[PDB]
Amino acid sequence: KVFERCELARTLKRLGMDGYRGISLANWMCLAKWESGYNTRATNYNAGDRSTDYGIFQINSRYWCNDGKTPGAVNACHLSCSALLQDNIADAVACAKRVVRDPQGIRAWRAWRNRCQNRDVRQYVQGCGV
């Protein structure tokens, strides 16, 4: 499904994302915005290393979820990459939380650095009631 902005913000808040490991809701919104445009169905194949990015946060198969076809891959979130394609984002959120429990935190996503880091991200949550 393709979430509407404020709908996603309240959904993420309800799932305990606001301030998770010091990361604000607006940052998660900015990440979801640039990674998939709030699309839970989004998939991006990386011909370069035979891995695939899944769901609203575009989590990679080489390290986080198992899709069985990625060479030399691990499954740190301990989920099928299929769980990262559901309309219900609870599993995707549990996995995003796992990603940020590592040293880099939100910096694990290259796009967050390019599109969200050191930027005014207030607009992502304005008017949403979060």
Domain ranges across the chain? 1-130
- What method was applied to determine this entry? X-ray
55 vs 85: CA distance, rounded Å: 5
- The pair of structure tokens assigned to 64 is 């986080």
24 vs 41: CA distance, rounded Å: 24
> Structurally, what CATH architecture does the domain formed by 1-130 represent?
Orthogonal Bundle (1.10)
Header resolution in angstroms? 1.8
- The neighbouring-strand residues paired with 53 are 44, 60
**Cβ–Cβ under 8 Å, residues 75 and 66:** yes
Going from the C-alpha of 20 to that of each of 2, 46, 70, the distances in angstroms are 23, 29, 29
As annotated, the active-site residues are: 35, 53
